Ligand binder design. Structure first.
Ligand SMILES: CC(=O)N[C@H]1[C@H]([C@H](O)[C@H](O)CO)O[C@@](OC[C@H]2O[C@@H](O)[C@H](O)[C@@H](O)[C@H]2O)(C(=O)O)C[C@@H]1O
Ligand SMILES: CC(=O)N[C@H]1[C@H]([C@H](O)[C@H](O)CO)O[C@@](OC[C@H]2O[C@@H](O)[C@H](O)[C@@H](O)[C@H]2O)(C(=O)O)C[C@@H]1O
Ligand SMILES: CC(=O)N[C@H]1[C@H]([C@H](O)[C@H](O)CO)O[C@@](OC[C@H]2O[C@@H](O)[C@H](O)[C@@H](O)[C@H]2O)(C(=O)O)C[C@@H]1O
Ligand SMILES: *[C@@H]1O[C@H](CO)[C@@H](O)[C@H](O)[C@H]1NC(C)=O
Ligand SMILES: *[C@@H]1O[C@H](CO)[C@@H](O)[C@H](O)[C@H]1NC(C)=O
Ligand SMILES: *[C@@H]1O[C@H](CO)[C@@H](O)[C@H](O)[C@H]1NC(C)=O
Lengths: 164, 321, 164, 164, 321, 321
């Protein structure tokens, strides 16, 4: 983990969250539950969709090999032809594999980035009103009803809510 | 008491991808961008059927090797399939000038229309139906290439030939002819009376003089003699002029180029499957939405991009414990 | 935002700061104001200047196409010539576009990095002496004169300054 | 520094730590000392070893130039041959240099990432039990014996340990 | 109370760039690295003016087509401009051996100096001022290529020629000559008396024997006859030897190669603008500090790098709401 | 009181690397991946020694230039080294057909075995030991190429030759022969009696007719005459047939191709060092574990990857103040 969120301070993944890539898990008075953060899940699906399509669009005009033949006294240009077509098909094989290796990584570190940016979305809201457990969870200094969870889940949480 | 927790997706997929710093990494979701399967067949290309030379070569087809009658008339094709070592080629031993350059032209053509430009019956002062050989048998009898006629003397005489044909079509004409190289001076006179002969050929552009080479050579297909073939593209309204006093292998049929286009000459032992496709390789056709493939570099049609890899998987999802 | 600073917890940009890429905005007793952090603005201008010049220097010996002609019976090598020159000019077009796409991104995430590293420059100095508002701002537990702002603005802030 | 750890809030490097890339430096009752974090030192050595080998493996089938000669009336194909071999050897020189420039950077930012992820390993454990000095160090609100240092050094620190 | 806030720059620029994960992203500052404009002219290159063949081909120039007198003497050039289909080429129909190989040599040369190596007056026993044709008219009268002379018989006689020229210059010599292919045996004797003729040519390196091809061909520019031209580079102190008893098209003027250098043969319908430049493309010159361009791949001079793109913009600044 | 601090490694290394945004950056640990040193020698390749033509060319070797006796018999080689301008080539002035195509074949061969296919003693009706020239001296006396014999007349007579050789080996045969081009008709009869001569050559595949070109040329190595050489690969069980009535330079020794394989023709002024290697360049051998090098692109053996750079250093460690 480059940002350290995924498989770092958060030990693993939540099987129960079949609603998206990033989300939450609360447990207040009115029960537990899961909710997919449709916000960051969208700026992520937008990411890889454009990424896949860009990798494909960057290589639609690549290199086509055409068939040419040569007689017994044209061994030089035949070899030139052979190595020149093998040449381009090698570099494009390199270009494809290398772009995949490089963008698979920037893909994983992108999900790590989003989690790190969601834990910080909540952390930069519940300043004193909670304690950072450090395993990925927070614990409130007040009770948080099912309408309190929603205000955090959409960006505007009210600070006026006492302490200890 | 009360809690709130931030986490991420996970599931049951075992699919792995690679990165620069780490191989074999399992993820939630992925996308394979590499098509690795074909149908192992030679298909039509968007409904237009390929021309599958079977045990005939391009030369055997174009010259009309008697063992190649299957291709006497040939409809529009999409691509041409030739075997690595066609057994029916130059039945009469010899050579074919600028053959690979002709083969290349063919990959730029989609349809020929055979037409008779000099009928075999028009030869009044030479023999035209005795130009046969055991080297080129048809159903057990001595024959010859169908599109050209091997003229010999008549009543112990070979008057010098002056034959001319004007391309009055709107299409380019592929015109083939040849010269015969005997094995000794006896054979020369036996076939042509005249001891010292030539064949001149002219167009707007072409200006050649051929003289036969009477010489001792090693037997091939039973013969020491040779037949050597030439060709040219006759442009509309241009004419071709032949003059010869022996050894002339005159044209009879030629090919109107009625459809230029994108094409190919595939080397494949495969034969006609009964199918249709958008992408054809020499080892089988492809039907895919993949952006890449690894089946064969020489390809024709709207195809994925060829790549030497055996696996190419893009990571869409995230890490999975 | 990969680091989440720009357009993340900081909603937008400060039009009034026409002095550089990164900076501050205070509002104490003696008024408001802007000041360009000439520190991180320099390690950033150094970044993209070297980046532009490296992209250009990596491609000064590219591929030149020269004119060659062929007759009617040299259609094979003519095609070889054609596709071989089209070949190199395709890969170099790929190399240029791909390097731009990849470095435009590492450029944006670089400005995001610097902001994230400036908010942490201040945050790692005014530990108890202020409260992280979370919108990009801090609020002091004491008064901060126009000489107090400068000590933070150049790296050494004095902790001995009481609380609440 | 992209993550800002190395040469950011931590001014420099510890010469005395000849045991690995990342580690610690304590000073309790029973003396000072150094200890290499064999944990993150391993996920780092695994990183660059695979990186070096991948850079090398991506380019084992590159482009070989073979010797071909041409007479005085083959100046066209001779030039074609020349520029086609110069062509491939240029792109592969580009590919090598460019991959090194790009991966040297993702290498430095990788060590910056690990330090940032180790300071956060400790910080997300000693929540109230210490004060973040901000120069890379922490100061305890209790005494920390040579067995207290080890619990932090291997992942599980006990919170029940009073305050001020 | 008291506050401190960390923020970033922003402004009014609408300029956008692309990344892998996102297109059309507005930024504070950017840099376009792609020059997309030329002047639509053919300029001098660093003060040395190009040679613009107009409706003349390289062959028409070098052989001296009468319709190409504009190029009888030609100063040092920087590059050569030829039209796609020059109308003044081989006025007398025929061919030019190793033409593309000569054209390539030309792209390696910057200046020829025409010199008379065999004056037309030196032919005492052959006619030298009757070698003209309606195919090559000058101001309405029958003429011929200026640099070579078409010799014919004199007083019903064509003594065999033995002519020799020694390159006593310090520069390589480009030497052109030709052979004439008649249409019939009557024309052969009418021009040359001798029925069976040849042209031998020797240097250190060259050793050729040419025999004319008397044959029937299709009329081009009114004629069925052909002129076929040859060339060689004569190295300093080497000599060229001609022997012929007919059909010889003898050299008169040749070209000292006085300046080898980097050059080009541009194919362009454009003509001489009146300007100067550091970078010239076939569709116009370039004046730019940009590292790239997208105007034309075939280029000459200190130029940006060609790329097929239509936009290439680098992001220097940052994101802008 | 009590403390805990997180930090990183540092040391004394001054080694620097480059990144995109910054040059000359010092680090703790690095890895140079660019081999920049060779031994300046021409070594054996995995224990098999190269064939170092010294002042002889491939043609001088294969034809048997008397100044090239060092190579009369030549063991299996790994690669071939030729100088840029070998002084011993065609001692008798002339030319060598399809020379570069032969040179290419050679890079595909590792061992020839010289064998006598037509002994000089077998010529009963022609002179075979007078075919010598001052152009090809051996220890001061007039000599000739060793592998071919320059036949001349005998008792004022040159009967037409009919010679045939059948390749009864299991290996391909490289067979060389030539034709002699005299300077005048007197020399022609002086050497061969017959004024009008030819040389025909046939195999399965080859069918050529050569006629000498008697003509005036500039002296090279003292002579105006020329020798022109030809070759072919004779396949097992095929035969080659020569017929000639003059100017024939008959084969005597030919080369069995006993070992096809990967090889090369290096252009290098260097000579035999006394060493062994896995990787050889024309300026010296390489012994390295590096994945890259910058010594020379034309290379042979298990070698690093060539790259035009002068420095390529990978960063393994981290930043170092
Ligand atoms: C038109 C004609 O004359 N066809 C002949 C043919 C030609 O004469 C010959 O090919 C010359 O090119 O000869 C053929 O018989 C050849 C036959 O001759 C024997 O002498 C030889 O030993 C056999 O192997 C065989 O070649 C032929 O069939 O080609 C007969 C043909 O009628
Ligand atoms: C040197 C010379 O004889 N010039 C002649 C030229 C040559 O004889 C001819 O080109 C042979 O190559 O002939 C020209 O007149 C040709 C004229 O002849 C008619 O028969 C024909 O029907 C016309 O179309 C036309 O070709 C010529 O101008 O080239 C005349 C010239 O004087
Ligand atoms: C087989 C034979 O006749 N060898 C001759 C050789 C040939 O006759 C000649 O090369 C023809 O190709 O002639 C040589 O002497 C040549 C000698 O002749 C003078 O006239 C000339 O002026 C000198 O420069 C020199 O060329 C020869 O050595 O090649 C002699 C040889 O015996
Ligand atoms: C071919 O025929 C047309 C029409 O009859 C004629 O005008 C043309 O000149 C002919 N071509 C030749 C070369 O004779
Ligand atoms: C050309 O002239 C020079 C000097 O007169 C002479 O030495 C040289 O041999 C000549 N070249 C030829 C091939 O005759
Ligand atoms: C060469 O010899 C073999 C065996 O004697 C024979 O069968 C073969 O036909 C010969 N080759 C030729 C071309 O004569």
């Amino acid at each position: 983990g480059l940002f350290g969120a995924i498989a770092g301070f958060i030990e693993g993944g939540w099987q129960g969250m079949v609603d998206g890539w990033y989300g939450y898990h609360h447990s207040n008075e009115q029960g537990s539950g899961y909710a997919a953060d449709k916000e960051s899940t969208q700026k992520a699906i937008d990411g890889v969709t454009n990424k896949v399509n860009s990798i494909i669009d960057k290589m639609n005009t690549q290199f086509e090999a055409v068939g040419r033949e040569f007689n017994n006294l044209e061994r030089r240009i035949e070899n030139l032809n052979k190595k020149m077509e093998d040449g381009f098909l090698d570099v494009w094989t390199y270009n494809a594999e290398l772009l995949v290796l490089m963008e698979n990584e920037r893909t994983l570190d992108f999900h790590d980035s989003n989690v790190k940016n969601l834990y910080d979305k909540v952390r930069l809201q519940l300043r004193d009103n909670a304690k950072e457990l450090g395993n990925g969870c927070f614990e409130f200094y007040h009770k948080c009803d099912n309408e309190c969870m929603e205000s955090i889940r959409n960006g505007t949480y009210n600070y006026p809510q006492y302490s200890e | 008491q009360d809690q709130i927790c931030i986490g991420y997706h996970a599931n049951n997929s075992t699919e792995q991808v690679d990165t620069i710093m780490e191989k074999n990494v399992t993820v939630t979701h992925a996308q394979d961008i590499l098509e690795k399967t074909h149908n192992g067949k030679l298909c039509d290309l968007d409904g237009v059927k390929p021309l599958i030379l079977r045990d005939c070569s391009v030369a055997g087809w174009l010259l009309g090797n008697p063992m190649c009658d299957e291709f006497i008339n040939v409809p529009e094709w999409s691509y041409i399939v030739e075997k690595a070592n066609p057994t029916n080629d130059l039945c009469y031993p010899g050579s074919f000038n600028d053959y690979e350059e002709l083969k290349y032209l063919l990959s730029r053509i989609n349809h020929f229309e055979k037409i008779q430009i000099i009928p075999k019956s028009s030869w009044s002062d030479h023999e035209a139906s005795s130009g046969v050989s055991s080297a080129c048998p048809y159903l057990g009898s001595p024959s010859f290439f169908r599109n050209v006629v091997w003229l010999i003397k008549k009543n112990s005489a070979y008057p010098t030939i002056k034959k001319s044909y004007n391309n009055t079509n709107q299409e380019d004409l592929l015109v083939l002819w040849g010269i015969h190289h005997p094995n000794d001076a006896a054979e020369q006179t036996r076939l042509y009376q005249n001891p010292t002969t030539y064949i001149s050929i002219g167009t707007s552009t072409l200006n050649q003089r051929l003289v036969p080479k009477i010489a001792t050579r090693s037997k091939v297909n039973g013969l020491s003699s040779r037949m050597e073939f030439f060709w040219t593209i006759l442009k509309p309204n241009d004419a071709i002029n032949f003059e010869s006093n022996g050894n002339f292998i005159a044209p009879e049929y030629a090919y109107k180029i009625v459809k230029k286009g994108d094409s190919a000459i595939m080397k494949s032992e495969l034969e006609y499957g009964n199918c249709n496709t958008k992408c054809q390789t020499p080892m089988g056709a492809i039907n895919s939405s993949m952006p890449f493939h690894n089946i064969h570099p020489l390809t024709i049609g709207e195809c994925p991009k060829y790549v030497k890899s055996n696996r190419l998987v893009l990571a869409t999802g995230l890490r999975n414990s």
